[PDB]
Amino acid sequence: AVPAPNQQPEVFCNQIFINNEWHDAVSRKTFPTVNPSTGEVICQVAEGDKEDVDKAVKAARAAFQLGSPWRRMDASHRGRLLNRLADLIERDRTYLAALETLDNGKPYVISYLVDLDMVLKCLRYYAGWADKYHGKTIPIDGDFFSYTRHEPVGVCGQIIPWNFPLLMQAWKLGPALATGNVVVMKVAEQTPLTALYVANLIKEAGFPPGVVNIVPGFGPTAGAAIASHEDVDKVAFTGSTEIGRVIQVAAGSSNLKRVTLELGGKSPNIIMSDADMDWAVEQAHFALFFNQGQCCCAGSRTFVQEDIYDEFVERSVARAKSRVVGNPFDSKTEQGPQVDETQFKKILGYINTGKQEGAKLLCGGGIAADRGYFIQPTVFGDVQDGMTIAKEEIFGPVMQILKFKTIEEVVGRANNSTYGLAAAVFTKDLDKANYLSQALQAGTVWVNCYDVFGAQSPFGGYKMSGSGRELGEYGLQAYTEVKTVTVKVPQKNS
Amino acid sequence: AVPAPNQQPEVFCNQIFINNEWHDAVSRKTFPTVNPSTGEVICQVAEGDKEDVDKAVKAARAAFQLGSPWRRMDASHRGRLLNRLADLIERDRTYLAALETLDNGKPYVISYLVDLDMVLKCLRYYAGWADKYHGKTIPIDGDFFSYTRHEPVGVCGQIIPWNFPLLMQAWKLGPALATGNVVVMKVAEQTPLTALYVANLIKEAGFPPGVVNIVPGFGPTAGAAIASHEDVDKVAFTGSTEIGRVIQVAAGSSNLKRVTLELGGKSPNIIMSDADMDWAVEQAHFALFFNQGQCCCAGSRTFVQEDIYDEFVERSVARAKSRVVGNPFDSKTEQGPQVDETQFKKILGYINTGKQEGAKLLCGGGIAADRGYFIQPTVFGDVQDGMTIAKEEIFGPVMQILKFKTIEEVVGRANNSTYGLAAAVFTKDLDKANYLSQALQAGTVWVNCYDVFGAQSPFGGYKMSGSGRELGEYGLQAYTEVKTVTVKVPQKNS
Numbered sequence A, B: 001a002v003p004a005p006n007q008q009p010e011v012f013c014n015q016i017f018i019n020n021e022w023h024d025a026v027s028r029k030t031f032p033t034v035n036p037s038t039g040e041v042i043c044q045v046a047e048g049d050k051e052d053v054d055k056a057v058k059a060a061r062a063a064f065q066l067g068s069p070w071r072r073m074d075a076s077h078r079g080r081l082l083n084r085l086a087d088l089i090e091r092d093r094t095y096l097a098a099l100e101t102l103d104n105g106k107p108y109v110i111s112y113l114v115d116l117d118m119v120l121k122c123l124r125y126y127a128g129w130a131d132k133y134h135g136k137t138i139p140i141d142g143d144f145f146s147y148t149r150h151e152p153v154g155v156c157g158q159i160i161p162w163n164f165p166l167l168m169q170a171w172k173l174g175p176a177l178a179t180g181n182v183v184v185m186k187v188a189e190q191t192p193l194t195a196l197y198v199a200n201l202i203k204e205a206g207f208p209p210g211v212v213n214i215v216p217g218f219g220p221t222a223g224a225a226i227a228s229h230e231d232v233d234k235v236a237f238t239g240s241t242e243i244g245r246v247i248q249v250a251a252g253s254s255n256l257k258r259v260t261l262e263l264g265g266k267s268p269n270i271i272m273s274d275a276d277m278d279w280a281v282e283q284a285h286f287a288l289f290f291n292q293g294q295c296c297c298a299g300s301r302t303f304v305q306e307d308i309y310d311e312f313v314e315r316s317v318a319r320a321k322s323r324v325v326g327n328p329f330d331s332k333t334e335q336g337p338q339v340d341e342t343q344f345k346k347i348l349g350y351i352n353t354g355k356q357e358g359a360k361l362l363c364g365g366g367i368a369a370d371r372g373y374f375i376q377p378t379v380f381g382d383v384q385d386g387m388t389i390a391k392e393e394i395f396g397p398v399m400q401i402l403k404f405k406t407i408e409e410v411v412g413r414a415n416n417s418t419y420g421l422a423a424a425v426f427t428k429d430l431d432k433a434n435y436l437s438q439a440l441q442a443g444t445v446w447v448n449c450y451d452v453f454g455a456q457s458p459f460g461g462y463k464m465s466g467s468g469r470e471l472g473e474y475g476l477q478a479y480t481e482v483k484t485v486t487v488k489v490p491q492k493n494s
């Protein structure tokens, strides 16, 4: 049961959020956000820049002062706040799911059942951590009492992408606030609107002014300003591997702020010949085509053992052809538009390269409608490791299928990448599953499943897919500064 | 109770250490290392560069291959090897302490009783951690079994300074080898020798070839290669704030290698009027002058409450005036030379800048011997926050004393710094101690003591003093890459 959507949700928040209040840009400039299903403008959004960032940072810094309401708040009370935020998001679930679909493209059924569910679970999970991340008492040599305090790192710049706008917001807010940090957040120009509404809910929830601030805007301006700022203690960036580096340099060239990065992947999904065929085919399809293919951990190299190759391919093409593209508000739609024109054209370029370099186009391969950024579910077979479509992250509904013979071979070919976000193994065999999950150089390895996240389990890259981890207990490490206090005492006993 | 030193220890090791063998610089070039007590050359040392770093990295990478001896070795056996290495270090304690003194300048008694003791304690502490740094089993939603593996980060570049040559090598190797990493280490040009000899003990202990590689050389060459290398997974830099920016830029410019940094400080040592006067005077002395003032966490801003300012200053002058400078091989020597000429002149400069900006010079202030780099114990009085000697890391035997009135005041002034390495508080009052330790923005806060380190207690900077921690459990975090494995299972039960 999905409650019926409002296919035209009214927009309420479209400005910069600072000190629990709404501001136009300093320059008064706006930019359009666009509905990728129709190509038409939804509304204008305040266009933040350096000066707006500086207003947000000073707001946050003030919120972070020794003695402020946020700093003195009981850790248990931060929990309550996060729990109240989640209740509010839940009250407004159908609206936020409709708005996510309107501005992003994804099916409203998915927005509602998946994105919004995972937002709630994320926020409620972290609410639980607020008062449970303990420091240590340490049995140091000599007559001393030594312990650590887990303090907040402070003013946290967070730059989130457009593929999962509300969920990426929650993944960043949950850990930061659970541990008492304050936030200056930069949301994607393609998908600003849902994050702004949540900001209104944050105010309603009762978070003190300045604890969360949001600056919609462009990357070269607003985002770069956050990364370079001399008073930002910590930046967390999610996006392309290419900009990831820009952020890391900016951090090194500014104030040596702490960095974490969740970046691209070219994740291998390995189907052993003993896999369950029906399950493997459907999971491999999910693995690649989920969210219009716009997933950092998309299963974009489907390695299939040669004995089952032909059948797997045949069944995969049939599933891709049956995949319904269209109005993301229609309950029947499995696939909406790509997020924007730039992505749309990038994907068509990658398809052209797939054709040029000699991979076998098995279905799709072109535009799927006359209006909106819709692309046909596309499958390439007989892909080779040296092909462009086997190396570069396409971020679209384009599936690559590669054939392999042995477990030793597929390990080397899977791991032959500068990426290492995720991987999967499909097999009935205990030893093969253990061999592969150990050998694969990836932040997450799924076994007989794909895209299984929990707020409980960490997620993040090996290699150039990023550094550090989000979710679980690990997600708090980057948001904590550790202070050691070591006190002379009269005479230590055990 | 110390064994008599050999005041001219033979040098056995002066080359580049790769795959458990000794190699000349590819370029055949060498460099001098100098005995700072006499200014004379001790011996020549292979001059490593980009090409030798590349060799070390390939060696390390090979030792790290899945299925190799190091990767297959039982966690508990990595522990055995660290313990055996510490045993070898203890066998050769008397020699290593003399060699440290000859190359560094620090008094031999201190080398023996402090440096070598802490080296042994650190390696032995980390040997214990080898089989105890657990991943997690995680109660994720749904019919899944989810768990994390704590895997080694991979090839780790490690760059270490000249102030505590052996100890800094131990603080680096301990956590890295305990967690199954491989190492390419650059030692300081001023103090290459002790670490190269330990390299021999590492071979002797039975570490597989390629697991530790040491390339001596210069910063702009050997150091930068490491920082920039496409196949180094992680770099740890200890040294100056200046080079720390170079490292983080070079990592973002290269392969997005993980980074930790331990940089400079200007640490506040705060004396409340209720302090134990004799104790606080001697501790404030130790806090500044220990190791010829060459400690990243030197108590180089001594704040003293106005009501006791005069006597404390007075009492400090008498202690600074009787601090035996001399041959560091003589058991009475408290202070040896600074480590080299460049440092030697920088410190004299800072002392000029000090007179010339209106601090009161209360004792010493010039050279202390005609031969070598001996400076006189130097105390400035009536120092102010604005002056250069109150802001800039001097790294020599020059003590600043400043005056304050209130606890609220001293907090603001203590914290007004781009640094945040260490701080201390001397007081008899419970509430003052707790108020200050909370309020001070520093990685380590000592109460009624100074420079108290335990292998068990983490250590590292706030703000621009660095990021990441060394020592204790937390010292393992930067050396571990977290893999999540998430397995479909028939039906999860609690």
Ligand SMILES: *CCC(=O)c1ccc(CC)cc1
Pocket: A163, A164, A262, A290, A294, A295, A296, A297, A451, A452, A453
């Ligand atoms: C980088 C995060 C990402 O792309 C992603 C992929 C899938 C899901 C749920 C299936 C969440 C986030």
Ligand SMILES: *CCC(=O)c1ccc(CC)cc1
Pocket: B163, B164, B167, B262, B294, B295, B296, B297, B451, B452, B453
């Ligand atoms: C940064 C490490 C350092 O300077 C230091 C200072 C003192 C000691 C022992 C008292 C160890 C390391």
Ligand code: NA
Pocket: A033, A034, A035, A036, A102, A103, A104, A189, A190, A191
């Ligand atoms: Na949009």
Ligand code: NA
Pocket: B033, B034, B035, B036, B102, B103, B104, B189, B190, B191, B339
């Ligand atoms: Na030397």
